[PDB]
Amino acid sequence: GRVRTKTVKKAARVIIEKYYTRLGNDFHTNKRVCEEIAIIPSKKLRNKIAGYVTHLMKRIQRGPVRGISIKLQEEERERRDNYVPEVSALDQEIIEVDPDTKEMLKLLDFGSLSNLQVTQPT
């Protein structure tokens, strides 16, 4: 007969653990998304992983919906990883600058800066 190998199983396990959202019911869309997610050099075991993720998502979809719910922090860790504010924190209106730093900027031809404020050491 035929039996699945351990490498395809563990790679498919990592793939379902990471990006459950992108996978779908059709087989070749699973194949192409698995192709573009990770680095797999050879075609055959990539197709094996595609078949195995298709099988396990058919198995998971039949399973009562709660496994899918507990996959909630993955996206928050992702949205946190890629969070930016609306206004840049480096875009400050007035920045305090040492007199020696001001001399360095004057000697380096940026003497016409407008956002600078020279604070003398008191």
């Binding site: 459950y20 959202t21 009562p64 919906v65 899918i68 909630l72």
Partner: protein, 604 residues
């Protein structure tokens, strides 16, 4: 013991008497009140005090539900609520048993009253994301068989529609986790329909409310389509028992056929599920619409302004339409298809041979009348198209020959003796399906020659001497003939006559001297089949010859075919003495021989 006993009373003592007792309520008087006492006791036996017999208790509730649900429904809602409450435990080891018990209750009941007992809390807009009763949808999917379809309409259409709308609304809203969960939930809700289509009781009145809905769901909802197709298929397979139901299905078939044809013929999709649905849905429709669609499909095929993909799709539709037509349409389709058997395109020839297989597949009906009407022309055409048959087209064609050998008359020996070498060459064809068909077809000629004479053994001897010269020619066709004899030795075991088999075995040893690996492998398979099949008392006369023949084979073919020789030595050592084979083999094989002993030592 107590569980088996209580199950025996529930199965034999109370189960046949549901019709006499009738429905029980909380205010029963006679034996119905005793059935209420039955359920009260078996529900009281579910509490925390037991906590170890829960497998047995849940089995008892399961058999109680499947015995008495339909007429004990007003009282068991409290125990259904308790069973739903028990699954909310942190660590419940009896989840499968509880699911089986709730499924048995649903199977005896139907989803409506048990949803009145334990409601689904996925009704539209929820606050949290941890649905506590999400197992009810798999339970309903796996265990609804005998309820009404109108409940499915009036409950599962608007709520699933709102869940789909909410999922897509959240899909443009950025949240992609809740949308996926709601899409999975609504797809799970749409998988209940094959369960609802199992044995409906009002499908003569409720199918009118689902025809346009199922049409639009199979038209512009791809994610449901397979299940949708399965639903209709499931319905047919166990729902056209009555006549008004089948009349309603045909009355809506007159609308569903163009839609399914357009979905199958579109370019790119689950084409094979649509094809199976079309096949069954043509087997349950009136023949005049079959003739009209067959004429339209023949017009579409014969049109030269059609693409190759469109031509192949309409040929698949022709394949589906072929076994369900009348005699005139089948004859006209055969007359149109007959010149296509010599086409150089392998796909067109494959579809034509599939048409010929499908029209000959029906044992009764207009296909059988067409077969007895055109047997001579079919034989002449199939013998004429033998030379120019492509390699994939071998796979259906043999089956078509199968479908014309099973009802073949006595004066047809020339056709068989002309088809035989093609059948052997197909026993060594590339396709495994073609090989299976050729093996089954050789078996079919074996049965067909058991009807042309009074004595079976001489008829099989004639059948063998019709295939004996094939052991003489080219190397690949000699290996073909050895594989054919290897297959033939397995079913008609004693009917050849062992001595004749022995002669064949001796000839195999000569072909065991060949340099080619395929011939040696086929000889080893024949030797294995002969050791399995023919008697040890006649083996003992012929052990020495075959074991000497395998003894002086080579080094290379001994090393390559080590597992087949290992199995042959195992079978010989099991069937005879280890020591006789030990002396009469050459040196090196001794080592392999001794290994078999620990199998006989340590399989015990």
């Amino acid at each position: 013991a107590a569980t088996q006993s209580l199950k025996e009373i529930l199965k034999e003592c109370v189960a046949p008497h549901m019709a006499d007792i009738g429905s029980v309520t909380s205010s029963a008087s006679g034996p119905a009140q005793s059935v209420a006492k039955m359920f009260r006791a078996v529900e009281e036996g579910l509490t925390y005090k037991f906590h170890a017999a829960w497998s047995s208790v849940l089995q008892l509730l399961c058999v109680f539900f499947e015995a008495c649900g339909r007429q004990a429904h007003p009282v068991m809602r409290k125990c259904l609520q308790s069973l739903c409450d028990l699954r909310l435990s942190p660590h419940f080891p009896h989840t499968a048993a509880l699911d089986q018990a709730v499924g048995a209750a649903v199977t005896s009941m139907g989803p409506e009253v048990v949803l009145q007992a334990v409601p689904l809390e996925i009704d539209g807009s929820e606050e949290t994301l941890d649905f506590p009763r999400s197992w009810l949808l798999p339970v309903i999917r796996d265990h609804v068989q005998e309820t009404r379809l109108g409940f499915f309409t009036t409950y599962f259409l608007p709520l699933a529609n709102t869940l789909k709308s909410k999922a897509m609304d959240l899909a443009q809203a950025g949240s992609t986790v809740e949308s996926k969960i709601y899409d999975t939930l609504q797809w799970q809700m749409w998988t209940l329909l094959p369960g609802f289509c199992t044995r409906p009781t009002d499908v003569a009145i409720s199918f009118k409310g689902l025809a346009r809905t199922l049409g639009m769901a199979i038209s512009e909802r791809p994610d449901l389509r397979v299940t949708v197709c399965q639903a209709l298929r499931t319905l047919i397979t166990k729902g056209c028992q009555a006549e008004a139901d089948r009349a309603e299905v045909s009355r809506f078939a007159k609308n569903f056929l163009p839609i399914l044809f357009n979905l199958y013929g579109q370019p790119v999709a689950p084409r094979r599920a649509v094809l199976e649905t079309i096949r069954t849905y043509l087997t349950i429709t009136d023949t005049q619409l079959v003739n009209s669609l067959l004429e339209k499909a023949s017009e579409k095929v014969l049109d030269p302004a059609s693409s190759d993909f469109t031509r192949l799709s309409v040929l698949d539709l022709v394949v589906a339409l072929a076994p369900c037509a009348d005699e005139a349409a089948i004859s006209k389709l055969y007359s149109t298809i007959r010149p296509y058997l010599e086409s150089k395109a392998h796909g067109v020839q494959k579809k034509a041979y599939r048409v010929l297989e499908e029209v000959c597949a029906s044992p009764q009906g207009p296909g059988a009348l067409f077969v007895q009407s055109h047997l001579e022309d079919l034989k002449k055409t199939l013998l004429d198209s033998l030379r120019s048959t492509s390699s994939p087209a071998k796979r259906p064609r043999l089956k078509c020959l199968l479908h014309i050998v099973r009802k073949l008359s006595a004066e047809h020996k020339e056709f068989i003796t002309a088809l035989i070498p093609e059948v052997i060459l197909c026993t060594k064809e590339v396709s495994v399906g073609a090989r299976k068909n050729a093996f089954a077809l050789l078996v079919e000629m074996g049965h067909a020659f058991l009807r042309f004479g009074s004595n079976q053994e001489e008829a099989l001897q004639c059948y063998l001497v019709l295939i004996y010269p094939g052991l003489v020619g080219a190397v690949t066709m000699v290996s073909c003939s050895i594989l054919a004899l290897t297959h033939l030795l397995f079913e008609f075991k004693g009917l050849m006559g062992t001595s004749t088999v022995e002669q064949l075995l001796e000839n195999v040893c000569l072909l065991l001297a060949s340099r080619t690996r395929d011939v040696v492998k086929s000889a080893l398979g024949f030797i294995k089949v002969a050791v399995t099949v023919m008697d040890v008392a006649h083996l003992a006369k012929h052990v020495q010859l075959v074991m000497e023949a395998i003894g002086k084979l080579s080094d290379d073919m001994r090393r390559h075919f080590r597992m087949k020789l290992r199995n042959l030595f195992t079978k010989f050592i099991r069937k005879f003495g280890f020591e006789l084979v030990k002396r009469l083999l050459p040196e090196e094989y001794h080592r392999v021989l001794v290994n078999i002993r620990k199998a006989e030592a340590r399989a015990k």
